[PDB]
Structure formats: C-alpha cells, structure tokens
Amino acid sequence: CTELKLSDY
Amino acid sequence: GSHSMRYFSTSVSRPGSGEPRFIAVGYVDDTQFVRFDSDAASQRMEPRAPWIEQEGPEYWDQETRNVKAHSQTDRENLGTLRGYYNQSEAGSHTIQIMYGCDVGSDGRFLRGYEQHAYDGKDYIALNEDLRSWTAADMAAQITQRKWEAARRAEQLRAYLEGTCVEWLRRYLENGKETLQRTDPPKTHMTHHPISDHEATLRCWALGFYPAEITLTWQRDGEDQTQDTELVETRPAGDGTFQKWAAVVVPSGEEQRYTCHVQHEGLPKPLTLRW
Amino acid sequence: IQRTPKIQVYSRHPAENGKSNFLNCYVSGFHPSDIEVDLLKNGERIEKVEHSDLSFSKDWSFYLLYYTEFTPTEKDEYACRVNHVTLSQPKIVKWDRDM
Numbered sequence A: 001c002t003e004l005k006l007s008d009y
Numbered sequence B: 001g002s003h004s005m006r007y008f009s010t011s012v013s014r015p016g017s018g019e020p021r022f023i024a025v026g027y028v029d030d031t032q033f034v035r036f037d038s039d040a041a042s043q044r045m046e047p048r049a050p051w052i053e054q055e056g057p058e059y060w061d062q063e064t065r066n067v068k069a070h071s072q073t074d075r076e077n078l079g080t081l082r083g084y085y086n087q088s089e090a091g092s093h094t095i096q097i098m099y100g101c102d103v104g105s106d107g108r109f110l111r112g113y114e115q116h117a118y119d120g121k122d123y124i125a126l127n128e129d130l131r132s133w134t135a136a137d138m139a140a141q142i143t144q145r146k147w148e149a150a151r152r153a154e155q156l157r158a159y160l161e162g163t164c165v166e167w168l169r170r171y172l173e174n175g176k177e178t179l180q181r182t183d184p185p186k187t188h189m190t191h192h193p194i195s196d197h198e199a200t201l202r203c204w205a206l207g208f209y210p211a212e213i214t215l216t217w218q219r220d221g222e223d224q225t226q227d228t229e230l231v232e233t234r235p236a237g238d239g240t241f242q243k244w245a246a247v248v249v250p251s252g253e254e255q256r257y258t259c260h261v262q263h264e265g266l267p268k269p270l271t272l273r274w
Numbered sequence C: 001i002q003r004t005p006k007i008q009v010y011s012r013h014p015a016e017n018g019k020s021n022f023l024n025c026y027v028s029g030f031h032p033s034d035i036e037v038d039l040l041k042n043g044e045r046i047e048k049v050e051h052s053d054l055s056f057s058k059d060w061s062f063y064l065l066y067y068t069e070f071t072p073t074e075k076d077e078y079a080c081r082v083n084h085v086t087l088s089q090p091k092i093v094k095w096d097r098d099m
Helices: B057-084 B138-149 B152-174
Strands: B004-010 B021-028 B031-037 B095-105 B109-117 B121-126 B134-136 B186-194 B197-209 B216-221 B222-226 B229-232 B241-250 B257-262 B271-273 C006-011 C021-030 C038-039 C062-070 C078-083 C091-094
Touching: B004 B152, B021 B057, B021 B152, B031 C062, B057 B152, B095 B121, B109 B152, B109 B257, B121 B138, B134 B138, B134 B186, B134 C091, B138 B152, B186 B271, B186 C021, B186 C091, B197 B257, B216 B241, B222 B229, B222 C038, B241 B257, C021 C078, C038 C062
Parallel strands: none
Antiparallel strands: B004 B021, B004 B095, B021 B031, B095 B109, B109 B121, B121 B134, B186 B197, B197 B241, B216 B222, B216 B257, B229 B241, B257 B271, C006 C021, C021 C062, C038 C078, C078 C091
C-alpha cells in the first residue's frame, strides 16, 4: 500500500 | 530471503494542455501488482497480480485516493520546479519518485527509501537513517528546509517502518505460492564460428525468478572479462527473466572457457561449456 | 538530459517453427519517457502489440516491454522498431533466434 500523501517542494 | 516493496511514479508535463501524464506502479520484489495511469479511462488503481484481487472496495478506494493525491502533488510540484529553475512553460519536464521498504526473512524492517528526481537527475532523497535529507542543489535545499521545518522525515519514517512493512508482509502471505518461489535458470551454450581464427560462445540463462543473477566467464580457471559481452537482464513476459553472456575465443579453444551461473534458486552455481 | 534507448528483441520461449510463442521488444535506458516501439513482421507493423506500464531503473532511465503472441516460421522476418527524440532516424533491430 501507498503513502497517504507526498509533500510539496 | 529478504523482500522489497516499491512504488515508482512518473509525472510528465504536457505544455499543450496543462494536465500532466501520471503513471504509478507498485512492485513486490520483481513482480508488479498495481498500476495507475491518468490517461486510462478507469481513473482508479488497477490490479496487476492475481493475489491483489482479494482486496476489498476499501483497499481500492483508499489506494486510488492516495495515488490521485500523489498525482496532484506532482502537478503542483512541476510548477514549483519550473519556478525554482527559471524554466518556461514551453518545455515538457518530468518528476520521478521511488519509495518503499525492504524486510528480512523474519518479516522485520530492514531499509526504507524515498528518492525524487527532476528531468532524470537527482533532486532530493531521504537518507538511510530515515532522519535526514540529501539535496542535489540549492533548489532542492529549499525543499529540504521546508521538510525539515515541517518534520516530514518523522512522518515518512512511520510509513516506511510501519505501514510499508506490514502491507509487504500481507502481500507476501496472500501471494506466497508465487512470490516466495524461486525458479532456477535453465542454462545452455550456443556456438557460432566467425572465421578461421575466431568463434563466439554464448551462455544462456532462461526462465528464472527473481531477476538477480550473475553470469561470469573463466578462461583456464581465472575470470575472463576481455572480449566479453553481457546483456541486461530482461523479462520473458511470463514473470520470469532471461540473460546471456558471450565471449569471442580462438576457434578450437572453446574448452578453455567456462560459463558460471549464480542464482538464488540454485543449490550451487552451475558451470557449463560448449 | 536525454538518453538513447537500448533495445533487445527476443522470444519468450525458444523458437520452434509452427509453435505459438511471444515476441518481445525490451527497451531501456532512455529519457525522456515518450517513445514509439513497434514489432514488425516482414517490415510491417504488427497490430496487436501490448506493453508494460512505464517504470524506471536506479539511474532514473525508463524501461518498457512490448510484446505480441506469434508463431515463428521459416520465412517470416521479425524486428523491433524504436523512435525517440534522441534518434535521428528510427532504430530497427532484427530478431535473431539466438540473441
């Protein structure tokens, strides 16, 4: 399963 | 037998419209199990291995929501990086991310990863300690400082050491009859006369899983690397892999050249000759 | 920024005339991701060709497998054609049963 969210650069 | 789970994602800007192409794939070891493609009609995460089909609607809903959020973050980040690097809107650019985790034979956490690239070059990555970042340039260090201030590493480490490992364990059990198999290579040698002076030997490994393998040549008992060729390991399309290694030798002297094959599925390495 | 594709064209199983098989073209090591890959039979594009989902290697270069079912014969010549921004003309690699 995936990360819940990534993050802004 | 350690194991890995990896997610690979690629977003590509399309100047003519403004909607990037986003493709994500998930793997356990060398076996793909899910995909998402923004160009596809479903707009959902899709299964690509039989053993993921038993997951219920809540799995597909959550994975789809997560991967769509990832695509939107990439979309915003394409604009942000255009700004950091002073690039125009005319060109296409690419963001790639790989993340995931490794477990040991006991199913416990070994290593975690999250690495980002822009236009095919390193941008920022989580370090092995899961507590610090490696930025490739000063633009990436803007991101690093943001993630440092937000304490992103602690949240990512929780995923890598928790969610990632527990789901890898679930997949390995649900798909154990295929994921925990080893298929040893089937090997053979071919031979092609070139001239009155030269001939080619080609050593073959076919039908093996996982993909990791080593093919080496020896001449009279010592490793032989001059005049050799080794192709990249390649998928057969049925879940197994293939590789070959070749050497040019003096015609008639083939007996001196042994091919050595190392693979996890072999009790001991194989040696073979023409 | 740009990396030219490597190309291998090969069958899934050892080729035997009259026996159903799969013809594969594995392209790798390329960047950017847009690429054209076709399998040719006697110089003509095969219509039913599928491909894997785009992924990439440690060095960030992309790879794809294109494939079709086929039954090899004595007379039929097969090849893989690749077009990419790095190529001044399409690259055509002929299938050799021992490669």
